[PDB]
Design a protein around this ligand. Sequence first.
Ligand SMILES: [Mg+2]
Ligand SMILES: [Mg+2]
Lengths: 68, 545, 23
Amino acid sequence: LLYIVQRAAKYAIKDSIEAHRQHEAEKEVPEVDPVPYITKEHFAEAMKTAKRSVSDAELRRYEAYSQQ
Amino acid sequence: VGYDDIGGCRKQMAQIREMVELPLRHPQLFKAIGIKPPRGVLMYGPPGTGKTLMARAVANETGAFFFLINGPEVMSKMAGESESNLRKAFEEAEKNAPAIIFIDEIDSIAPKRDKTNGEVERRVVSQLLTLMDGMKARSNVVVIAATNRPNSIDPALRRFGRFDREVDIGIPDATGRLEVLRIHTKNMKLADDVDLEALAAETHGYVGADIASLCSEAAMQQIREKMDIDAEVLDSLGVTMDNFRFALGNSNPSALRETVVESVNVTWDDVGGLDEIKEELKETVEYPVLHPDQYTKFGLSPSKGVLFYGPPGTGKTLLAKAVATEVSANFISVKGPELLSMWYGESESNIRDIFDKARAAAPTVVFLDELDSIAKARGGSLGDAGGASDRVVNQLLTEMDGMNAKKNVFVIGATNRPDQIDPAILRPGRLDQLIYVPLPDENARLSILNAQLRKTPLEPGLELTAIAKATQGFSGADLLYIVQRAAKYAIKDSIEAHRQHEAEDPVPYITKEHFAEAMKTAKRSVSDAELRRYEAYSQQMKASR
Amino acid sequence: AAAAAAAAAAAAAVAVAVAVAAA
Ligand SMILES: [Mg+2]
Ligand SMILES: [Mg+2]
């Protein structure tokens, strides 16, 4: 869960920095980002890279230890 | 020296200045409050931070008596003479006027009194304890001590009455380094081009004296540029910004001077293919270190670890070299089995020391080559050396995730056997993203071929699309072998042509014939078994989906 | 008059060995 939220924040900062760079460029030729809040799309496209930390073998071993 | 010399530690300057001046400028106010002020302080931190500089500044500015004691100076050869010297020093300080004692390098005169086995030292520390506290302890005097290892002091000495307040003069911040640079460049003559803000941004781990060394080196470079004596050259030196860039590209922080890496010269254009992985690495390394305001705006810490895994020679160490050379953060290149030792606990001691250096000179990047060598599964080995490997992997687990500060440590691991890694390392928080580095495709093989042929002359009509279409299962190492064979055949042709010429420039390019006849022995290194193994590992990772 | 003297003798360490099993 920490990893997924961290990836979402990383995508959000990427969006913020590219928006700021575009704003600076158009100023060359106020709000800092189009939205200071993390959007639903950030979660939507940060879900493609998460995994599961513990395999079923480790889970089974821990379950057996709990049973015994 | 004064208060305009010590820079980058506002809190410590204010704390020491008030403690030393206010009780010696308005004693009536402290009689009105009722309590006496703190009277003993121990300055501690890494070397070259400004402890002795602060002592010098206090001595110069405050008009009271000042007595200085270097550590070993007290001891003498005749029996019971060191304690006589300490008593004489304290009496001299007390008798004349209110005074400030300064004891430099207290670690030499204040051991732990528990691990020591001498006699005179234990009596000198006991005499110090009695002088600092007891019947007729001390009147209208203040004691400052300086140390590099506060843990090497007996705890009985660091209690209220002897050394009540502990000031921590540690590594500066970006603003601190900028202020120190501004202090150190206040007397030399600078050209207008110099911009100290960028220089302070790129000085990622320099502390105190490091900045001074940088300035000195830059000046020396300027001196050896306009010396190839008349006042014409005596005037108009003009330390350019290029001098500072050269000195910064040459020097490294003294903390990492122990583990300075050999200067390998690669660049990002040297890495063919893997464009998206290169951009991902750029994104994960440069954003936390250059843009912390946005991360604190969202209120989350950054991602740190990463693990490359794939067939041998796909370019893992190449990516690591690129990171080492073309990134502003410091690099600690660490070998896998180098850190092991025959003794008991020295492996974990070395690991702790390495990570202490990394966290000291932050932001830092540490490269763990062949992570499966030291970080294997736990308890699998029946016949072991006392579980030394188990303790090593546990030390890594706690050091990469424990009661630490999580300031800036970027761990990159590189192993081609991702099944032998302890699953406790693969969880997010330690190595949170696993990047597979697959075999290049045709558009990546062409890019690689251009990457290694960017310093080579070739025949104008030599197109590499045929070579790319012809290598199918090859890797970057295999393409390297092909180019090396072609070059060696070219060298042979040159040598025989020169022999013919002297029998009684011949070749300026690698011919198509050279490539064609060096492609005879071309070979794919990775077998189908290994490729299927890696594909199965990736599909097992995706099986969670 | 008397005099003092310093002395630093030695230290002793512990090593770690590896063994081989036959399954
Ligand atoms: Mg000093
Ligand atoms: Mg390698």
